[PDB]
Coordinates of C-alpha atoms in Angstrom, one line a residue:
Chain A
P1 CA 44.3 95.5 159.5
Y2 CA 43.4 99.1 159.7
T3 CA 44.5 102.3 157.7
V4 CA 43.3 105.7 157.9
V5 CA 44.4 108.0 155.3
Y6 CA 44.1 111.8 156.4
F7 CA 45.8 115.1 156.7
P8 CA 48.1 115.8 159.7
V9 CA 45.3 117.0 161.7
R10 CA 43.0 115.7 164.5
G11 CA 39.7 117.0 162.7
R12 CA 37.5 114.3 161.7
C13 CA 39.8 111.4 162.5
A14 CA 39.9 112.2 166.2
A15 CA 37.0 110.4 167.6
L16 CA 37.7 107.3 165.2
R17 CA 41.4 106.9 166.6
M18 CA 40.4 107.7 169.9
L19 CA 37.9 104.5 169.8
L20 CA 40.7 102.2 167.9
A21 CA 43.1 103.3 170.8
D22 CA 40.8 102.8 173.8
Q23 CA 39.8 99.3 172.2
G24 CA 43.0 98.2 172.0
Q25 CA 43.2 97.9 168.1
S26 CA 46.2 98.5 165.9
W27 CA 46.3 100.8 162.9
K28 CA 48.5 102.5 160.4
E29 CA 48.3 106.3 159.5
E30 CA 48.7 107.4 156.2
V31 CA 49.6 111.2 156.4
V32 CA 48.5 113.2 153.5
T33 CA 50.3 116.7 152.9
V34 CA 48.6 119.8 151.4
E35 CA 51.1 119.4 148.8
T36 CA 50.3 115.9 148.0
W37 CA 46.4 116.6 147.9
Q38 CA 46.7 119.5 145.8
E39 CA 48.4 117.2 143.2
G40 CA 44.9 116.1 142.5
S41 CA 45.4 112.4 141.8
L42 CA 44.7 110.9 145.5
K43 CA 41.6 113.4 145.7
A44 CA 40.2 112.4 142.1
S45 CA 40.6 108.9 143.5
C46 CA 38.4 109.5 146.6
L47 CA 34.9 108.5 146.2
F48 CA 33.4 111.8 147.2
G49 CA 36.8 113.5 146.9
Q50 CA 37.7 114.0 150.2
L51 CA 39.3 112.5 153.3
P52 CA 39.4 110.4 155.5
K53 CA 39.8 107.2 153.6
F54 CA 39.7 104.3 155.5
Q55 CA 41.0 100.6 154.6
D56 CA 40.1 97.5 156.5
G57 CA 41.5 94.6 154.7
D58 CA 40.5 95.1 151.1
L59 CA 37.5 97.0 152.3
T60 CA 37.6 100.7 151.5
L61 CA 35.5 103.3 153.3
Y62 CA 35.0 107.0 153.1
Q63 CA 33.0 109.4 155.5
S64 CA 34.2 109.7 159.2
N65 CA 30.6 108.5 160.6
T66 CA 30.7 105.6 158.1
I67 CA 34.2 104.5 159.4
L68 CA 32.8 105.2 163.1
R69 CA 29.7 103.0 162.3
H70 CA 31.8 100.2 160.9
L71 CA 34.0 100.1 163.9
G72 CA 31.2 100.3 166.1
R73 CA 29.4 97.5 164.2
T74 CA 32.5 95.3 164.0
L75 CA 33.7 95.9 167.4
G76 CA 30.6 95.7 169.4
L77 CA 30.2 99.3 170.3
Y78 CA 26.7 99.9 168.8
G79 CA 24.4 99.3 171.7
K80 CA 22.8 96.0 173.1
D81 CA 20.1 95.9 170.8
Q82 CA 17.9 97.5 168.1
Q83 CA 16.3 100.1 170.4
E84 CA 19.9 101.1 171.7
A85 CA 21.2 101.1 168.4
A86 CA 18.8 103.7 167.1
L87 CA 19.4 105.9 170.3
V88 CA 23.4 105.5 169.5
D89 CA 22.5 106.8 166.0
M90 CA 20.4 109.8 167.4
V91 CA 23.3 111.0 169.7
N92 CA 25.8 110.6 166.7
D93 CA 23.6 112.3 164.4
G94 CA 23.4 115.2 167.0
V95 CA 27.1 115.2 167.7
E96 CA 27.6 115.5 163.7
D97 CA 25.0 118.5 163.5
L98 CA 27.0 120.4 166.0
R99 CA 30.2 119.1 164.4
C100 CA 29.3 120.6 161.0
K101 CA 28.5 124.2 162.7
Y102 CA 31.8 123.8 164.5
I103 CA 33.7 123.3 161.4
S104 CA 31.6 126.1 159.6
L105 CA 32.7 128.5 162.4
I106 CA 36.2 127.3 162.2
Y107 CA 36.8 127.7 158.4
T108 CA 34.1 130.0 157.4
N109 CA 33.8 132.7 159.9
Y110 CA 35.6 132.2 163.1
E111 CA 36.6 135.8 163.9
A112 CA 33.1 137.5 163.3
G113 CA 30.9 134.4 164.3
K114 CA 32.7 133.2 167.5
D115 CA 30.8 135.2 170.1
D116 CA 27.3 134.3 168.6
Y117 CA 28.5 130.8 168.4
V118 CA 29.5 130.7 172.0
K119 CA 26.5 132.3 173.3
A120 CA 24.5 129.5 171.4
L121 CA 26.6 126.7 172.7
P122 CA 24.8 126.0 175.9
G123 CA 21.6 125.3 174.2
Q124 CA 23.6 122.8 171.6
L125 CA 25.3 121.2 174.6
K126 CA 21.9 120.8 176.8
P127 CA 20.4 117.8 174.4
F128 CA 23.5 115.7 175.7
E129 CA 23.2 116.6 179.2
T130 CA 19.8 115.6 179.1
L131 CA 20.2 112.1 177.4
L132 CA 22.9 111.5 180.4
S133 CA 20.6 112.5 182.9
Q134 CA 17.9 110.0 181.4
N135 CA 20.6 107.2 181.5
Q136 CA 21.5 105.9 185.0
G137 CA 22.0 109.3 186.2
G138 CA 24.4 110.1 183.7
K139 CA 26.9 107.5 185.7
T140 CA 27.8 105.4 182.7
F141 CA 27.7 106.3 178.9
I142 CA 25.7 108.1 176.4
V143 CA 23.3 105.4 175.7
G144 CA 23.0 101.8 177.7
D145 CA 25.8 100.9 180.0
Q146 CA 28.1 99.8 177.3
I147 CA 30.4 102.4 175.5
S148 CA 29.5 102.9 171.9
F149 CA 30.8 104.7 168.9
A150 CA 28.9 107.7 169.7
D151 CA 30.5 108.2 172.8
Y152 CA 34.0 108.6 171.4
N153 CA 32.2 111.2 168.8
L154 CA 30.6 113.0 171.6
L155 CA 33.9 112.9 173.6
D156 CA 35.8 114.6 170.7
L157 CA 33.2 117.2 170.5
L158 CA 33.1 118.0 173.9
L159 CA 37.0 118.0 174.2
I160 CA 37.4 120.5 171.3
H161 CA 34.6 122.6 172.5
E162 CA 36.4 123.2 176.0
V163 CA 39.4 124.3 173.6
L164 CA 37.1 126.9 171.5
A165 CA 35.1 127.9 174.6
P166 CA 36.7 127.3 178.0
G167 CA 34.5 126.5 181.0
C168 CA 31.7 125.6 178.3
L169 CA 31.1 122.3 180.6
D170 CA 30.7 124.2 183.9
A171 CA 27.1 124.5 183.8
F172 CA 26.7 120.9 182.8
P173 CA 27.8 118.4 185.9
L174 CA 26.9 115.2 183.9
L175 CA 28.7 116.3 180.8
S176 CA 32.0 117.5 182.9
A177 CA 32.0 114.4 184.8
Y178 CA 31.4 112.2 181.6
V179 CA 34.5 113.7 180.2
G180 CA 36.5 113.5 183.1
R181 CA 35.5 109.8 183.4
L182 CA 35.8 108.5 179.6
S183 CA 39.1 110.4 179.5
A184 CA 40.6 108.5 182.5
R185 CA 39.8 105.0 180.6
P186 CA 43.6 103.8 180.7
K187 CA 44.2 103.3 177.0
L188 CA 42.3 106.4 176.0
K189 CA 44.5 108.7 178.6
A190 CA 47.7 107.1 177.4
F191 CA 46.4 108.0 173.8
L192 CA 45.3 111.5 174.6
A193 CA 48.4 112.1 176.3
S194 CA 50.8 110.8 173.3
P195 CA 52.5 113.0 170.9
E196 CA 50.6 110.9 168.1
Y197 CA 47.6 113.1 169.4
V198 CA 48.9 116.2 171.3
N199 CA 51.2 117.1 168.5
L200 CA 48.7 117.3 165.9
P201 CA 46.4 120.3 165.5
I202 CA 42.6 120.2 166.0
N203 CA 42.0 121.9 162.5
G204 CA 43.7 122.5 159.4
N205 CA 43.6 126.2 159.5
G206 CA 45.3 126.7 162.8
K207 CA 42.0 128.0 164.5
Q208 CA 40.6 126.3 167.6
Chain B
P1 CA 2.9 101.2 165.4
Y2 CA 4.6 104.0 163.6
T3 CA 3.9 108.0 163.7
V4 CA 5.9 110.5 162.2
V5 CA 5.5 114.2 163.5
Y6 CA 6.3 116.7 161.0
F7 CA 5.7 120.0 158.9
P8 CA 3.4 119.5 156.1
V9 CA 6.1 119.2 153.5
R10 CA 8.0 116.4 152.1
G11 CA 11.4 117.5 153.2
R12 CA 13.4 115.0 155.2
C13 CA 10.3 112.7 155.8
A14 CA 10.1 112.0 151.9
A15 CA 12.5 109.1 152.1
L16 CA 11.4 107.6 155.2
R17 CA 7.8 107.7 153.9
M18 CA 8.6 106.1 150.6
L19 CA 10.5 103.6 152.4
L20 CA 7.5 102.7 154.6
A21 CA 5.0 102.8 151.8
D22 CA 7.1 100.7 149.5
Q23 CA 7.7 98.1 152.5
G24 CA 3.7 98.0 153.1
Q25 CA 4.2 99.5 156.5
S26 CA 1.2 101.3 158.0
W27 CA 2.0 104.7 160.0
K28 CA 0.4 107.6 161.0
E29 CA 1.0 111.4 160.1
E30 CA 1.1 113.8 163.0
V31 CA 1.0 117.2 161.0
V32 CA 2.5 120.4 162.8
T33 CA 1.6 123.6 161.4
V34 CA 3.8 126.6 161.6
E35 CA 1.3 128.2 164.3
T36 CA 1.6 125.4 166.6
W37 CA 5.3 125.2 166.1
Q38 CA 5.7 128.8 166.9
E39 CA 3.8 128.3 170.1
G40 CA 7.0 126.7 171.3
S41 CA 6.1 123.9 173.5
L42 CA 6.2 121.0 170.9
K43 CA 9.9 122.4 169.9
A44 CA 10.8 122.6 173.4
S45 CA 10.0 118.9 174.1
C46 CA 12.1 117.9 170.9
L47 CA 15.4 116.3 171.9
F48 CA 17.6 118.9 169.5
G49 CA 14.6 121.5 169.2
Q50 CA 13.6 120.0 165.6
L51 CA 11.3 117.7 163.5
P52 CA 11.0 114.9 162.4
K53 CA 9.9 113.2 165.5
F54 CA 9.3 109.3 165.2
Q55 CA 7.5 107.1 167.5
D56 CA 7.9 103.3 166.9
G57 CA 5.9 102.2 169.8
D58 CA 7.3 103.8 173.0
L59 CA 10.4 104.5 171.2
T60 CA 10.9 108.0 170.3
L61 CA 13.7 109.0 167.8
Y62 CA 14.7 112.2 166.4
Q63 CA 16.9 112.9 163.4
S64 CA 15.9 111.8 159.7
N65 CA 18.6 109.4 159.0
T66 CA 18.3 107.8 162.6
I67 CA 14.7 107.2 161.6
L68 CA 16.0 105.6 158.3
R69 CA 18.8 103.3 159.8
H70 CA 16.2 102.4 162.4
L71 CA 13.5 101.4 159.7
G72 CA 16.6 99.7 157.8
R73 CA 17.8 97.7 160.4
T74 CA 14.5 96.3 161.7
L75 CA 12.8 96.0 158.2
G76 CA 15.8 94.4 156.8
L77 CA 17.1 97.0 154.3
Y78 CA 20.6 97.2 155.8
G79 CA 22.6 95.2 153.6
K80 CA 23.2 91.3 153.5
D81 CA 26.4 91.7 155.7
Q82 CA 28.7 93.9 157.7
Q83 CA 30.5 95.0 154.4
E84 CA 27.5 96.0 152.8
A85 CA 26.0 97.8 155.8
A86 CA 29.3 100.0 155.8
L87 CA 28.6 100.8 152.1
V88 CA 25.0 101.4 152.7
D89 CA 26.0 103.7 155.5
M90 CA 28.7 105.4 153.2
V91 CA 26.1 106.1 150.6
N92 CA 23.8 107.6 153.1
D93 CA 26.5 109.8 154.4
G94 CA 27.0 111.3 151.0
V95 CA 23.3 111.5 150.3
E96 CA 23.1 113.4 153.5
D97 CA 26.0 115.6 152.4
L98 CA 24.5 116.8 149.2
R99 CA 21.0 117.2 150.8
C100 CA 22.6 119.7 153.3
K101 CA 23.7 121.8 150.2
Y102 CA 20.5 121.7 148.5
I103 CA 18.9 122.6 152.0
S104 CA 21.4 125.3 152.3
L105 CA 20.6 126.8 148.7
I106 CA 17.0 126.5 149.0
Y107 CA 16.6 128.2 152.5
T108 CA 19.9 130.3 152.2
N109 CA 20.4 131.5 148.9
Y110 CA 18.2 130.2 146.1
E111 CA 18.3 133.1 143.8
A112 CA 22.1 134.3 143.8
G113 CA 23.4 130.6 144.3
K114 CA 21.0 128.4 141.8
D115 CA 23.3 128.9 139.0
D116 CA 26.7 127.8 140.7
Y117 CA 24.8 125.0 142.3
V118 CA 23.6 123.8 139.2
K119 CA 27.0 124.0 137.5
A120 CA 28.2 122.2 140.4
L121 CA 25.5 119.5 140.5
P122 CA 27.2 116.9 137.8
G123 CA 30.3 116.5 140.0
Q124 CA 27.9 115.9 143.0
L125 CA 26.0 113.2 141.2
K126 CA 29.0 111.3 139.9
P127 CA 29.6 109.5 142.7
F128 CA 26.5 107.8 143.0
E129 CA 26.6 106.8 139.0
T130 CA 30.3 105.6 139.7
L131 CA 28.9 103.2 142.7
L132 CA 26.0 102.2 140.4
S133 CA 28.5 101.1 137.6
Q134 CA 30.4 99.1 140.2
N135 CA 27.3 97.3 141.4
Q136 CA 26.0 94.5 138.8
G137 CA 26.2 97.4 136.0
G138 CA 23.9 99.3 138.0
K139 CA 21.1 97.0 137.1
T140 CA 19.9 96.4 141.0
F141 CA 20.3 98.6 144.0
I142 CA 22.9 101.2 145.1
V143 CA 24.5 98.6 147.3
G144 CA 24.2 94.8 146.9
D145 CA 21.3 93.1 145.3
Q146 CA 18.5 93.9 148.0
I147 CA 17.0 97.6 148.4
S148 CA 18.2 99.4 151.7
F149 CA 17.4 102.7 153.5
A150 CA 20.1 104.2 151.4
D151 CA 18.3 103.5 148.1
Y152 CA 15.3 105.6 149.2
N153 CA 17.3 108.4 150.7
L154 CA 18.9 108.6 147.2
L155 CA 15.9 108.3 145.3
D156 CA 14.5 110.9 146.9
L157 CA 17.5 113.2 146.5
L158 CA 17.6 112.5 142.9
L159 CA 14.1 113.2 142.3
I160 CA 14.1 116.7 144.1
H161 CA 17.0 117.6 142.1
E162 CA 15.2 116.4 138.6
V163 CA 12.9 119.2 139.9
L164 CA 15.7 121.7 140.9
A165 CA 17.6 121.2 137.8
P166 CA 15.3 119.5 135.0
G167 CA 17.5 117.0 132.8
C168 CA 20.3 116.9 135.4
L169 CA 20.2 113.1 135.2
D170 CA 20.6 112.9 131.6
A171 CA 24.4 113.0 132.0
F172 CA 23.8 109.9 134.2
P173 CA 22.4 106.8 132.4
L174 CA 22.4 104.4 135.4
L175 CA 21.0 106.9 137.7
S176 CA 18.4 107.9 135.1
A177 CA 17.4 104.1 134.6
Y178 CA 17.6 103.6 138.4
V179 CA 15.0 106.1 139.1
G180 CA 12.6 105.1 136.8
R181 CA 13.1 101.3 138.1
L182 CA 12.6 102.4 141.8
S183 CA 10.0 104.6 141.0
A184 CA 8.1 101.7 139.2
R185 CA 8.0 99.4 142.1
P186 CA 4.2 98.8 142.7
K187 CA 4.0 100.3 146.4
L188 CA 6.2 103.3 145.6
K189 CA 4.8 104.0 142.2
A190 CA 1.4 104.2 144.0
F191 CA 2.6 106.0 146.9
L192 CA 4.4 108.8 144.7
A193 CA 1.1 109.2 142.7
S194 CA -1.0 109.8 145.8
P195 CA -2.3 113.0 147.2
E196 CA -0.5 112.2 150.3
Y197 CA 2.7 113.1 148.3
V198 CA 1.8 115.1 145.5
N199 CA -0.1 117.6 147.4
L200 CA 2.6 118.5 150.0
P201 CA 5.4 120.9 148.8
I202 CA 8.9 119.8 148.6
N203 CA 10.1 122.4 150.9
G204 CA 8.8 124.7 153.5
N205 CA 9.3 128.0 151.8
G206 CA 7.9 127.5 148.4
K207 CA 11.0 127.0 146.5
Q208 CA 12.3 123.9 144.9

């Protein structure tokens, strides 16, 4: 089946977990403590010396976006055709870009850089609002009329930014409605309300 | 057909160009000067306010890796099956990770950070040597026995690092042979030797 190996945080595993849960998939969580990680053996065995590590049968994967694309490819959450697949990729790359800036802030200079980051946020969120506006008036998904792995990744990005900058979605009707709509999906709603998700910190350094 | 809109540098368009050239594809280059870019209109029209911008017929794409995956998907350079596709993604994500560090050095702190970056390089290159060692003894491609978009991206990464740190591949026999082998592919060899490639700077700030 599926096994995700990660630290006890939502972080880079939040989106793929939302995906698995919403898609009704079963998976095993192998929790790695800082103690175990600092021992060194696990890290050494990781391709790029980092987690998450993912197992699908005897296929072992690394890189959160690789895991997302893999699940999207195998579960049919990658667009209806090549054109949509490319747009799904474009959205995910954009999500990843902002996630990297978010991660940099959280771990590199939260205190000194938070204000500038938040002032810059609207301009970083605008593209996703625009994408929604060009897709059925933003009434369905980020790309096409079927959910894709990019939807879960974007949803997570929006959720964590709401925590970082409460109200950051107020100026964006489509993104706001989108978050509420996707979060309301039965299986996802149940997962997001579960201790499995709720009792895990967003990040590893206690900042958010 | 294909049109790539970019600044007059190799940068993030080097790999996709190598791919198009080696695959015998025709494309148009729309060169954007710093003057034109600073005017602001073009940038404003870009989804994420950046280049490259790519056009495949009326399909407009942004994000270099999105363009690479799109070409890989439509040209059959994405593995022979789902397992390989996931491994191709894993390699590309790894390439992108190191490219971001490279870009950061080049534009953020070349002078002060070069030594530290170079000392760290071997550890950053090792994973690709390992991947090669696990795939037919590194005699074919990075994943499987057919070329993939990740091969062009990795080849470019290796080429620019040889310029940054001459001899950095001496400690990696498989990567070294791989670079020589792929670079020898007829169409690629011709492209790499052409003014179209040779007379373009690797980066935009004149550092390399």
